[PDB]
Structure 1
Amino acid sequence: TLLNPYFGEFGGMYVPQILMPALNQLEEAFVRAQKDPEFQAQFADLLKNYAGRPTALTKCQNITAGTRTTLYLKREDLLHGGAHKTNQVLGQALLAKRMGKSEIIAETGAGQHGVASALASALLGLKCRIYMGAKDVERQSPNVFRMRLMGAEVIPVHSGSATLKDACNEALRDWSGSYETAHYMLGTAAGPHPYPTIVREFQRMIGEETKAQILDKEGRLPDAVIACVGGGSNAIGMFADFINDTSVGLIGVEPGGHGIETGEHGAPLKHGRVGIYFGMKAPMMQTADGQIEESYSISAGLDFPSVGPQHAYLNSIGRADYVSITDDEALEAFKTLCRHEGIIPALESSHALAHALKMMREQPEKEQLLVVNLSGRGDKDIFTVHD
């Protein structure tokens, strides 16, 4: 390969032999594109004029009143589509086009990646196919309807647990037989190389913009940047540009569900076991026998049963620290931001907020300059937090 497929022990290319040329093709295209100023100018144009880049960096004065913490929120909730996912899909769509591909295959759990893939394909003239577990489709009619309105074909998968896991299975099954005309638009910074690297590079704007913005407004780098971790894309997008700034802490928040001790959570990085699945060697939600399990969280978007290999690596060497936040903890952060700042955060993003809130509240007198990545809008969750 042209690039290293591993981040220490994690990563790799664990896919059937038949799919190897597809991965080697994608890697070469990515390396070329990254060197191509024309591709770069095209990506920048769509990001700016279509998606709404650069996104705001908002100071939250009300929330921190009475403490020595200064909190800012990177406004990815203001990106077209209402989530950070949009950045990624635009670049991957241009990559598909650069390869002479005319079809897009995509997986989705909560529906967000599907909506993002459907909009990128509509705009760029690609035929989009989306796989969604039958359980998720039933539970996600608004997003399925959005995907369909956007011209995408939505296909329910009834195999296994009929959820994300299984949708991810069907997508690769399809891809192994259609890679010659279709490109698989993977939804997170996980899966077989070159996906973890590609998604990071197409999500990098986030931290790059956050750096310039904080330098302008505070004349200093942040003490720590915090992000929720479902599969790892919004988190790595935030972290990347700060990795070499050793004084800047990198904190990833995994869903604790009803509590780690109950077993009802979605935190494989800190509480699962290393396994090999989804074309990757990484920490996983797994039975003692090695049967793949489901992740649980009040937030549907944090249900990927594993985690990006770069995170597992950043953790092992001590560069980044990972923690968890329970459903109730995230509900509280959600409620709090609504009332004090007038911003409705996605329940996914609320896990990151909840942790910055703990950091503040636990040590009110500590001088701290914090940045939370508000990865998405919460209009989506109004009914969930309602009942």
Structure 2
Amino acid sequence: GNFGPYGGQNVPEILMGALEELEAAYEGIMKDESFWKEYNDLLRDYAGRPTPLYFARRLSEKYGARVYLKREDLLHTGAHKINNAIGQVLLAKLMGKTRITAGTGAGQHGVATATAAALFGMECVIYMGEEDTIRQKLNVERMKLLGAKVVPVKSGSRTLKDAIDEALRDWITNLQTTYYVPGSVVGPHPYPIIVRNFQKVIGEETKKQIPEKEGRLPDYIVACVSGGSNAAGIFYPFIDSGVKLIGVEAGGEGLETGKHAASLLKGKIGYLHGSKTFVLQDDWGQVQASHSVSAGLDYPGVGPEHAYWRETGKVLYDAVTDEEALDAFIELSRLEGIIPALESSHALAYLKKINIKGKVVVVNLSGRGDKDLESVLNHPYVRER
């Protein structure tokens, strides 16, 4: 489970048995034709894969480019999170677990997990930072209808980091019954590999769809990056292909303000939630609070596979600010009639930063923005527009 120097299993010893059991069960389903049959049927008819690769004619006109959007917003529940949640809750069911727990920030992982738990008939307890239960209220409502318990977490910065802290405490307290479902590619081995291997369907589809429109590989693929799962999923089949892969982190109020979530660009090597990776830390090794207008990007660490891709130059990383992402959310809504997630708006904002005239650019549209409507319409920057 190492990506260069990053990754590993940096956990309390009591979890080692659970992780060994998960690693064995996962290696088992890796060759299990009936796991993949059932999983792939649900991806097709329940989640709605393959998702289209949409030529965004008006965006393309505005930038002078050929811009395609990989439409993960069209999945069931409205984000790429469902790819991973169905796969892991299916695994949990096959391992004989009876209960699921997870932490969630935008609420999309929580909704995806609650959906799979409902489908597979499992008890489901979702931890969510209290500030996130307010700016992402639509997803609290969906999780309640799906039968999940939602526990607001009032400690720390009351956002995703603190929700994951409490879900991990719950998992340790409940190891007999409970499977912990990470939403991103952060966590102790084998979780980064499991999540990335459920999300790489995105890149696999893209790789097949782009020669049908343009007859070669794209020039660029752009995806937003917090923990990194939607970006790992679309990048992984293109690593070392020569495509320019660009991961976009949350620059928040600005990378020099101290109010951002840009772990690769501004963090230091450290340990978070089981991985050795880049973490926003002070000079005494204390993890710092992140900030982003996007609840899904508001997390102080990043997946170890991305730390490794950055170090080896296989993927390039940069950031855009809260205001740039808000502008891109509004622009896509107005020009293409698609309301993007505020996470994915960071990737769309980056179109203004590359020299793309004449280029074929794929943007991973990781989810839809209905959860973000109240927050965007009330934001002071948008109110000053």
Shorter-chain TM-score tier: over 0.9
Deviations 1:92-129 (CA, angstroms, capped at 9, x unpaired): 01110121111101111221111111011001111101
Rounded to whole Å, the distance in 1 between the matches of 2:204 and 2:135 is 36
Percentage of pairs with the same residue: 57
* Residues 146 and 301 of structure 1, relative CA distance in 2, 3 Å threshold: same
Deviations 1:332-381 (CA, angstroms, capped at 9, x unpaired): 2112111211111111101101112332xxx36x4311100000111222
Name the structure 2 match of 1:233.
229
1:65 to 46, 61, 66: 61
Name the structure 2 match of 1:292.
287
Give, as a single letter, the amino acid of the residue that structure 2 aligns with 1:113. Answer: H
Secondary structure at the residue paired with 1:119?
Answer: helix
**Would you say the 8 A contact 1:10–1:313 is kept in 2?**
yes
Name the structure 1 match of 2:382.
none
Name the structure 2 match of 1:106.
102
Name the structure 2 match of 1:168.
164
* Residues 350 and 135 of structure 1, relative CA distance in 2, 3 Å threshold: closer
Name the structure 1 match of 2:47.
51
Name the structure 2 match of 1:215.
211
Rounded to whole Å, the distance in 1 between the matches of 2:272 and 2:99 is 25
| 2:368 counterpart of 1:372 | no
* Alpha-carbon offset, residue 244 of structure 1: 4.0
Name the structure 2 match of 1:185.
181
After the TM superposition, which residues 189-204 of structure 1 pair with which residues of structure 2 at under 5 Å, given as runs? 189-204=185-200
Rounded to whole Å, the distance in 2 between the matches of 1:66 and 1:272 is 35
Give, as a single letter, the amino acid of the residue that structure 1 aligns with 2:295. Answer: A
Name the structure 2 match of 1:125.
121
Name the structure 1 match of 2:342.
347
What TM-score does the superposition give when structure 2 sets the normalisation length? 0.95
| 2:4 counterpart of 1:8 | yes
Give, as a single letter, the amino acid of the residue that structure 1 aligns with 2:211. Answer: L
**Would you say the 8 A contact 1:333–1:357 is kept in 2?**
no
Rounded to whole Å, the distance in 2 between the matches of 1:67 and 1:142 is 33
Rounded to whole Å, the distance in 2 between the matches of 1:139 and 1:218 is 40
* Residues 332 and 295 of structure 1, relative CA distance in 2, 3 Å threshold: same
- Tell me which moved more, 24-33 or 317-326: 24-33
Secondary structure at the residue paired with 1:225?
Answer: strand
* Alpha-carbon offset, residue 67 of structure 1: 5.1
Rounded to whole Å, the distance in 1 between the matches of 2:62 and 2:110 is 42
Name the structure 2 match of 1:260.
255
Name the structure 1 match of 2:309.
314
Rounded to whole Å, the distance in 2 between the matches of 1:130 and 1:168 is 10
Give, as a single letter, the amino acid of the residue that structure 2 aligns with 1:100. Answer: G
Rounded to whole Å, the distance in 2 between the matches of 1:244 and 1:29 is 30
Rounded to whole Å, the distance in 2 between the matches of 1:141 and 1:240 is 33
Deviations 1:209-259 (CA, angstroms, capped at 9, x unpaired): 0111101121111111110001100000001111142x1111100011111
Secondary structure at the residue paired with 2:256?
Answer: helix
Give, as a single letter, the amino acid of the residue that structure 1 aligns with 2:189. Answer: H
Name the structure 2 match of 1:159.
155
Secondary structure at the residue paired with 2:158?
Answer: coil
**Would you say the 8 A contact 1:83–1:377 is kept in 2?**
yes
Rounded to whole Å, the distance in 2 between the matches of 1:186 and 1:256 is 24
Deviations 1:121-179 (CA, angstroms, capped at 9, x unpaired): 00111110111223333444332221111111112223333332222112222212322
- Tell me which moved more, 103-112 or 130-139: 130-139
Give, as a single letter, the amino acid of the residue that structure 2 aligns with 1:224. Answer: Y
**Would you say the 8 A contact 1:228–1:349 is kept in 2?**
yes
Deviations 1:2-61 (CA, angstroms, capped at 9, x unpaired): xxx110011110110000011111111111111111111111000000001111100012
List gaps (5 residues or longer) in structure 1. none
After the TM superposition, which residues 24-35 of structure 1 pair with which residues of structure 2 at under 5 Å, given as runs? 24-35=20-31
**Would you say the 8 A contact 1:76–1:84 is kept in 2?**
yes
Rounded to whole Å, the distance in 2 between the matches of 1:367 and 1:328 is 27
Secondary structure at the residue paired with 2:367?
Answer: coil
* Residues 335 and 18 of structure 1, relative CA distance in 2, 3 Å threshold: same
Task: Give the length in aligned residue pairs.
Answer: 378
* Residues 66 and 376 of structure 1, relative CA distance in 2, 3 Å threshold: closer
* Residues 140 and 370 of structure 1, relative CA distance in 2, 3 Å threshold: closer
What TM-score does the superposition give when structure 1 sets the normalisation length? 0.94
Name the structure 2 match of 1:381.
372
**Would you say the 8 A contact 1:252–1:320 is kept in 2?**
yes
* CA root-mean-square deviation: 1.4
